[PDB]
Amino acid sequence: KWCFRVCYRGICYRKCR
């Protein structure tokens, strides 16, 4: 699926829809 990467406060995570 489409997943984007969010880097928040040093925490980079993939967020999938």
Distance of CA 14 to the CA centre of its chain: 3
Method of determination?
Answer: NMR
Spatial CA neighbour of 12 closest among 1, 2, 4: 4
DSSP secondary structure code for residue 17 in this structure: -
Contact assessment for residue 1 and residue 14, using Cβ atoms and an 8 Å cutoff: no
Contact assessment for residue 17 and residue 5, using Cβ atoms and an 8 Å cutoff: no
Buried b (16+ CB within 10 A) or exposed e, 1-17: eeeeeeeeeeeeeeeee
| Structure-token pair, residue 5 | 């990467």
- What is the residue type of 15? K
Contact assessment for residue 17 and residue 3, using Cβ atoms and an 8 Å cutoff: yes
